[PDB]
Enzyme design. Structure first.
Site, PDB file in Angstrom:
ATOM      1  N   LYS A  23       0.831  -1.208   0.000  1.00 42.82           N
ATOM      2  CA  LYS A  23       0.000   0.000   0.000  1.00 42.82           C
ATOM      3  C   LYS A  23       0.861   1.251   0.000  1.00 42.82           C
ATOM      4  O   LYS A  23       0.579   2.241  -0.663  1.00 42.82           O
ATOM      5  CB  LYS A  23      -0.934   0.012   1.215  1.00 42.82           C
ATOM      6  CG  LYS A  23      -1.573   1.377   1.425  1.00 42.82           C
ATOM      7  CD  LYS A  23      -2.375   1.429   2.713  1.00 42.82           C
ATOM      8  CE  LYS A  23      -1.782   2.467   3.656  1.00 42.82           C
ATOM      9  NZ  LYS A  23      -0.295   2.443   3.597  1.00 42.82           N
ATOM     10  N   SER A  24       1.937   1.194   0.780  1.00 43.75           N
ATOM     11  CA  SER A  24       2.895   2.284   0.886  1.00 43.75           C
ATOM     12  C   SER A  24       3.497   2.680  -0.461  1.00 43.75           C
ATOM     13  O   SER A  24       3.551   3.865  -0.787  1.00 43.75           O
ATOM     14  CB  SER A  24       4.049   1.870   1.811  1.00 43.75           C
ATOM     15  OG  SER A  24       3.648   1.953   3.168  1.00 43.75           O
ATOM     16  N   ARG A  28       2.926   5.933  -3.131  1.00 37.16           N
ATOM     17  CA  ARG A  28       4.052   6.820  -3.465  1.00 37.16           C
ATOM     18  C   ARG A  28       4.170   6.951  -4.983  1.00 37.16           C
ATOM     19  O   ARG A  28       4.392   8.024  -5.514  1.00 37.16           O
ATOM     20  CB  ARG A  28       5.377   6.311  -2.890  1.00 37.16           C
ATOM     21  CG  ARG A  28       5.662   6.845  -1.491  1.00 37.16           C
ATOM     22  CD  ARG A  28       6.397   5.821  -0.642  1.00 37.16           C
ATOM     23  NE  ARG A  28       6.624   6.302   0.716  1.00 37.16           N
ATOM     24  CZ  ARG A  28       5.796   6.168   1.743  1.00 37.16           C
ATOM     25  NH1 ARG A  28       4.625   5.551   1.616  1.00 37.16           N
ATOM     26  NH2 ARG A  28       6.141   6.662   2.932  1.00 37.16           N
ATOM     27  N   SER A 167       3.997  12.312  12.631  1.00 34.51           N
ATOM     28  CA  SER A 167       3.885  11.490  11.437  1.00 34.51           C
ATOM     29  C   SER A 167       5.064  11.713  10.493  1.00 34.51           C
ATOM     30  O   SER A 167       5.383  12.848  10.131  1.00 34.51           O
ATOM     31  CB  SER A 167       2.575  11.791  10.693  1.00 34.51           C
ATOM     32  OG  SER A 167       2.411  10.893   9.610  1.00 34.51           O
ATOM     33  N   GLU A 311       3.846  -0.168  12.458  1.00 32.73           N
ATOM     34  CA  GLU A 311       2.714  -0.824  11.816  1.00 32.73           C
ATOM     35  C   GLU A 311       2.601  -2.301  12.167  1.00 32.73           C
ATOM     36  O   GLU A 311       1.560  -2.931  11.937  1.00 32.73           O
ATOM     37  CB  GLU A 311       2.865  -0.632  10.296  1.00 32.73           C
ATOM     38  CG  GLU A 311       4.044  -1.440   9.737  1.00 32.73           C
ATOM     39  CD  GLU A 311       5.255  -0.557   9.494  1.00 32.73           C
ATOM     40  OE1 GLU A 311       5.344   0.521  10.114  1.00 32.73           O
ATOM     41  OE2 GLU A 311       6.125  -0.917   8.678  1.00 32.73           O
ATOM     42  N   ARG A 344      -3.632   2.564  18.748  1.00 28.44           N
ATOM     43  CA  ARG A 344      -3.618   1.102  18.795  1.00 28.44           C
ATOM     44  C   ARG A 344      -3.049   0.533  20.087  1.00 28.44           C
ATOM     45  O   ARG A 344      -3.250  -0.643  20.396  1.00 28.44           O
ATOM     46  CB  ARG A 344      -2.814   0.555  17.606  1.00 28.44           C
ATOM     47  CG  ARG A 344      -3.121   1.247  16.287  1.00 28.44           C
ATOM     48  CD  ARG A 344      -3.177   0.243  15.146  1.00 28.44           C
ATOM     49  NE  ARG A 344      -2.786   0.838  13.870  1.00 28.44           N
ATOM     50  CZ  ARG A 344      -1.714   0.489  13.172  1.00 28.44           C
ATOM     51  NH1 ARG A 344      -0.905  -0.464  13.616  1.00 28.44           N
ATOM     52  NH2 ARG A 344      -1.452   1.098  12.024  1.00 28.44           N
ATOM     53  N   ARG A 385      -5.404  -3.436  10.635  1.00 31.75           N
ATOM     54  CA  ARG A 385      -4.432  -4.256  11.352  1.00 31.75           C
ATOM     55  C   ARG A 385      -5.037  -4.836  12.623  1.00 31.75           C
ATOM     56  O   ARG A 385      -4.676  -5.942  13.020  1.00 31.75           O
ATOM     57  CB  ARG A 385      -3.183  -3.449  11.703  1.00 31.75           C
ATOM     58  CG  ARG A 385      -2.715  -2.497  10.615  1.00 31.75           C
ATOM     59  CD  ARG A 385      -1.231  -2.636  10.337  1.00 31.75           C
ATOM     60  NE  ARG A 385      -0.936  -2.597   8.905  1.00 31.75           N
ATOM     61  CZ  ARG A 385      -0.281  -1.591   8.331  1.00 31.75           C
ATOM     62  NH1 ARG A 385       0.124  -0.579   9.086  1.00 31.75           N
ATOM     63  NH2 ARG A 385      -0.029  -1.584   7.029  1.00 31.75           N
TER      64      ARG A 385
END
Length: 424
Positions: A23-24, A28, A167, A311, A344, A385
């Site tokens: 996904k990353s 990009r 972030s 993650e 989380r 997740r």
């Protein structure tokens, strides 16, 4: 909505899995292809791109700015330029990447673009990035979601003093589009210090692949020089983050799972991942066009530092909850998690204790004491997740049900099927 029964593995799991694209990397690649196009370097293609709610959003956000994105499977074509119409409004949805990677893009626009999201999206950190755009020329309305980017025609660049504590995506968002800024960019991160380093390093690596010249030789600082972003064919790797959910099944079952097409050369932190697995005495094995993990017969508590691969915490928290009874595991370096739209740390604590487990936040993260678990409803909080972590636990605990397995659609639409085929 109905719950999802997490199937059990009372015997070692044996299986070969194909996980969909990263996904990353996909997002990009979309942003870079977008930029290449807008610069006027023609169409780019993305092969093996991830097709998921998160990438759909970037897709969409990208078409809203003026680009043309076609392809119905794993193969996306990006073309066009940045020409939003009056009143354009990007839905960030659940994509934190859209929230942070696309506002710079719009800065390269002429018209004002609004950025909006749902309740959850709105509780997302985004201020230091908004102020940074101001520092570097962009006119910006609002201090949170929804905000308006008032694009005029270009972006100056210059150097900003931004705190990306909140972030890494603040840095990556700035870096990806800085090639097209006027004075390029010099990002300076203050104090200490970059959690999720691989995330920024994946961006640096892909920039260079697009021929952009970026200077990251002194820590906490990045210099990107103005220049062309190249149109090209991006090959996307399988998502190694999601692959760890599948490998965890071999870990907790003493079984064996093969991930096909594991990249030998990665823009992903594959290294960090395999090391973590070897910490459990998992046996890694480079197989025929696959990555093979053989789970141990059992394992006790571990101390693992997750600062660079935050993650991974939910899947790893699950692994810890399924250690030999009595084992104490400490998950460290993830203080910075305690503050994302989806805390989380608290989430994980709450859900694991609701099953009869023992999971307490510590100042640096979590300590998990392995205690007998009981049936229950694992709540995903719409967190893909969290969903997959419940799935892992359910492998070793009968009667576990996830409230919303469709939260996996964010990065892995076919998770239920893939998990079902793996376990059975």
């Amino acid at each position: 909505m109905k719950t999802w029964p997490a199937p059990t593995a009372p015997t070692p799991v044996r299986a070969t899995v194909t996980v969909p694209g990263s996904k990353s990397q996909t997002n990009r690649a979309l942003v870079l292809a977008a930029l290449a196009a807008a610069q006027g370097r023609g169409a780019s293609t993305i092969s093996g791109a991830l097709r998921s709610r998160d990438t759909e959003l970037m897709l969409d956000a990208l078409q809203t700015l003026g680009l043309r994105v076609d392809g119905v499977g794993s193969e996306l074509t990006v073309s066009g330029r940045i020409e939003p119409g009056p009143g354009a409004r990007v839905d960030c949805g659940l994509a934190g990447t859209v929230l942070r990677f696309v506002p710079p893009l719009a800065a390269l626009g002429s018209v004002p673009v609004t950025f909006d999201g749902d309740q959850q999206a709105r509780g997302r950190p985004i201020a230091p990035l908004l102020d940074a755009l101001r520092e570097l020329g962009v006119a910006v309305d609002g201090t949170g979601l929804p905000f308006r980017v008032r694009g005029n025609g270009s972006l100056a660049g210059g150097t900003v003093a931004i705190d990306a504590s909140a972030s890494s995506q603040f840095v990556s968002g700035l870096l990806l589009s800085a090639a097209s800024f006027t004075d390029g960019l010099t990002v300076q991160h203050t104090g200490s210090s970059l959690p999720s380093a691989p995330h920024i390093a994946m961006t640096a690596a892909m920039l260079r692949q697009a021929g952009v010249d970026i200077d990251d030789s002194t820590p906490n600082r990045w210099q990107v020089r103005p220049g062309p972003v190249a149109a090209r064919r991006w090959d996307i790797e399988p998502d190694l983050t999601n692959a760890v959910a599948f490998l965890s099944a071999a870990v907790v079952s003493g079984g064996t799972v093969r991930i096909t097409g594991w990249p030998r050369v990665s823009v992903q932190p594959a290294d960090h991942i395999l090391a973590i697995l070897r910490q459990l005495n998992a046996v890694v094995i480079h197989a025929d066009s696959s990555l093979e993990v053989r789970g141990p017969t059992g394992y006790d508590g571990f101390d693992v530092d997750l600062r660079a691969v935050g993650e991974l915490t939910p899947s790893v928290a699950a692994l810890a909850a399924l250690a030999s009874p009595g084992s104490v595991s400490r998950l460290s370096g993830i203080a910075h998690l305690r503050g994302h739209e989806t805390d989380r740390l608290a989430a994980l604590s709450t859900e694991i204790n609701r099953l009869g487990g023992t999971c307490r936040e510590t100042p640096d993260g979590l300590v998990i004491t392995a205690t007998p678990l009981r049936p229950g409803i694992w709540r995903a909080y719409a967190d893909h997740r969290m969903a997959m972590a419940g799935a892992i636990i359910g492998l070793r605990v009968a009667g576990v049900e996830v409230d919303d397995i469709a939260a996996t659609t964010k990065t892995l639409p076919e998770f239920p099927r893939l998990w079902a085929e793996m376990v059975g």
